[PDB]
């Protein structure tokens, strides 16, 4: 497509939904409204940044999925927050 050969497969909306997947996968947020909190805003910003970075890094859509899922895995493996998150 435009920025990558695979680009046309993944529009902003899917990027947004994937960013949400990052947020919930890292931090299974109780309520969408909670995303307004500055703490969450930072995590949202992080997830956007990371997703963008992965998009530009990924030679192929499959890779984009892989290194994202891997990154999530690393986050939980390292930071292991899933259930704690709230705190």
């Amino acid at each position: 497509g435009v920025r990558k050969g695979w680009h046309e497969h993944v529009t902003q909306d899917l990027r947004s939904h994937l960013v949400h997947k990052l947020v919930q996968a890292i931090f299974p947020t109780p309520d969408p409204a909670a995303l307004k909190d500055r703490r969450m805003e930072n995590l949202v910003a992080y997830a956007k940044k990371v997703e963008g970075d992965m998009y530009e890094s990924a030679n192929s859509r499959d890779e984009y999925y892989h290194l994202l899922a891997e990154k999530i895995y690393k986050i939980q493996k390292e930071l292991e927050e899933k259930r704690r998150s709230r705190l």
């Binding site: 999925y65 994202l68 999530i72 895995y73």
Partner: peptide
């Protein structure tokens, strides 16, 4: 463990499939 690995991984991967599946609303 393995189940958790695959769930956490799959959660991300699922998205496009879920979306194109839910071609309704």
């Amino acid at each position: 463990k393995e189940k958790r690995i695959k769930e956490l991984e799959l959660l991300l991967m699922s998205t496009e499939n879920e979306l194109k599946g839910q071609q309704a609303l």
